[PDB]
């Protein structure tokens, strides 16, 4: 049942995309290898998270 991982990842990328809009969300704490997260980190993180959401969207569509 490959729907289960693809379903989870769609929920998780969607939430991570939503939650990065909150600058003080604990979702920012996952980047353990960044000494000081500056604004340029957050801007790139938001871009990357949107791209991963779209990938997860496609992968879920393909599994359903």
């Amino acid at each position: 049942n490959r729907q289960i991982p693809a379903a989870a990842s769609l929920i998780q990328t969607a939430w991570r995309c939503y939650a990065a809009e909150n600058p003080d969300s604990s979702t920012w704490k996952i980047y353990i290898r960044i000494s000081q997260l500056r604004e340029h980190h957050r801007a790139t993180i938001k871009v990357i998270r949107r791209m991963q959401y779209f990938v997860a969207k496609k992968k879920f569509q393909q599994a359903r």
């Binding site: 289960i4 989870a8 991570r16 790139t44 938001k46 779209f54």
Partner: protein
């Protein structure tokens, strides 16, 4: 789209286009991701680009970047993903079952991420998440 949003998206674009050549390649994308502590494979980077590369040239120019960053179904697909775990069709998923799936499957959210998710989603605090309400909240 605001005039402020477009400039913010142009600024973000520049952080990826290390070239200055007007396009983001898979190599520049992996360069940025490794700078954040991630290690993506080449196939992962390709799938990222291909979801955004509307002209199929293999790179991302600024209008493509802006199109994706400005981007309808979606709500329904995220509902359909929750419905995968709504086996009895509750309309509801247990906070316990949600933490389990979120933490141990797919992308593996942290426990602190799941905390934030459940606090926002479980409006009445009974430990059962109305996920259609939560999908609304995210969109």
């Amino acid at each position: 789209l605001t005039e402020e949003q477009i400039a913010e998206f142009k600024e973000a674009f520049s952080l990826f286009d290390k070239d200055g050549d007007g396009t983001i390649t898979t190599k520049e994308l992996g360069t940025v991701m490794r700078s954040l502590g991630q290690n993506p494979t080449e196939a992962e980077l390709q799938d990222m680009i291909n979801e955004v590369d509307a002209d199929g040239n293999g790179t991302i120019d600024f209008p493509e970047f802006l199109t994706m960053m400005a981007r309808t179904d979606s709500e329904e697909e995220i509902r359909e993903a929750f419905r995968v775990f709504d086996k009895d069709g509750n309309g509801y998923i247990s906070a316990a079952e949600l933490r389990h799936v979120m933490t141990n499957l797919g992308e593996k959210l942290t426990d602190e991420e799941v905390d934030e998710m459940i606090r926002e989603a479980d409006i009445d605090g009974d430990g059962q998440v109305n996920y259609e309400g939560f999908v609304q909240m995210m969109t």
